[PDB]
Amino acid sequence: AVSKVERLMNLVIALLSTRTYLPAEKIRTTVAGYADSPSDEAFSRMFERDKNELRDLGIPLETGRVSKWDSTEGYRINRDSYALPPIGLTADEAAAVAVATQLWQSPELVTATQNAVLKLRAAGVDVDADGVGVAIASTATLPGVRGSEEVLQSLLSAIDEGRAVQFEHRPSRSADYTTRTVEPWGVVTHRGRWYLVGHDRDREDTRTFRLSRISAAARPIGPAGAVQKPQDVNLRDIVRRAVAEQPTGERARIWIAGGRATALRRQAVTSTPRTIGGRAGEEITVDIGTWDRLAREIASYGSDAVALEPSSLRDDVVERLRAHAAGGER
């Protein structure tokens, strides 16, 4: 009567401690747990199941010939390939790992992170979370981390398996869902927002998709190893380009009353004091960027911020203010 865990531990210990390849019959005779099989076929099936499980657990089994004077196949576990290289960790890195191990919430990701942390601690370092005293408050309201958790797991699994993905994506809530099948290249984060980078098989272009928009149906399709992304492609540069295209638009002169518009004050490029209409303040020459965003920012402050140049932005602001002042009828 030998338990499965004990049998597997005995098998891996026996393989690790032997410098010569071991055939199946020797393993059956020597290692405990392989002497109770009523028949040879049952032993072969049990051994194959155990070897499949051990190979699935990531242990690098190697199969070869016992010697140049024999032909029966034998098994071994390389001591060099099985052992991770030693690593020295300072207090800062230990604190970083301890803080980062408490982000995920999916059971699979939690289990994987826990196993990785256990292996890292067993490597020799001491990872402690109570020293920093930093916790996580939000666990079910995050639109980037918590909301985009299962989708990120599916994308990571597909990238690891080297397979294309098919999913449903919508540019906005008003628009309609569209089925997109793309070959992924990686995942890049920016300002705490994930952005899947891939090449579409329906448009043939490099696209970045915000993981918040994509639903949980990130179905993996295609044979393994069929995805060969170019190495020279820099995903982070493409993400940065996709984040913002218009550098500065133009230079605009906007008057803002003093003591307010602090958010706009921080965005000021050049400033000059001036008093207009009995109200003092500063006229600032600044950038443009997105026209709609700047128009909204100017219109939010109302009389506090007065646009001077260009005249088109002033006309847009005046039109929006008149639409507001119409009484809501239109």
Added chain:
Amino acid sequence: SQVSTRLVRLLNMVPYFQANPKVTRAEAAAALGVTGKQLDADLDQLWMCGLPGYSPGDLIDFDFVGDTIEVTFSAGVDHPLRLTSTEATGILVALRALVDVPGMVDPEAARSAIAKIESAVGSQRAVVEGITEDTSAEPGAAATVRTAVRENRALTLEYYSASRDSLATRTVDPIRVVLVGDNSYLEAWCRSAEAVRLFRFDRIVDAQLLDDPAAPPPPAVAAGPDTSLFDADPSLPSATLLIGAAAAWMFDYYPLRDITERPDGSCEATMTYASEDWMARFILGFGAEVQVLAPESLATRVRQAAEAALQAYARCV
């Protein structure tokens, strides 16, 4: 399955004990995150298993000194098991996700950890990568905040209140740092108003360290990690507004409630506002894209503000 994880843990226990010569029971339980009985059963099961031959000098044997654990013969178990692709990828993803969040972790430590893990596991440029190789966007206030949290020293913070649109200089004592959504907030007790408040890093112009290591009242009274006193309160007023199809920008970054759909664009939503001025500015920003429905007083105030802005623009040149 569960058996796989149990086998991995029981195989990696030996190097953990080899690294720490005299680790006690409580430390081992805390490190491996298992109960006392489970730890004892796993240790006993590992005791009676080892090299083939099963001589008492051929299997792994311990040396129990009181309540301490030490290894005398590892039988070849000298190094921990390698890292699979999934766990290493998850760790790297978490580390690269927390490096951009301001104040939760030192960026230099995160970069060093990334480099060391990549060197240990042999990862290449085919993995997740950040945007900023060297941020340099830290103004130094975040480091001062972390130092004050570690050393429990008084801090002076100049915070920009967007609801009131002002700059307020306060003397606060930190309690803990928490993450909410994509905006991490430093939690601090302020004696100016004598309350627990959450300040955002991007709204802090600068921080000043002071030599007043005074323990805040909440540790001596109540030190709940959440303390969501007004994160979601019924007393908070809510305005009912109509949103056009084009103005979908606010549909993502703001908590819209009671969303009603209409092809004619005659169905609306409801959103809470902290202050009347904040909601008025938010409404005026979108222009004609957003139409005011309720309350009537808010609509009248918005109309008066728009008329005043139009008059000011007419007077100005």
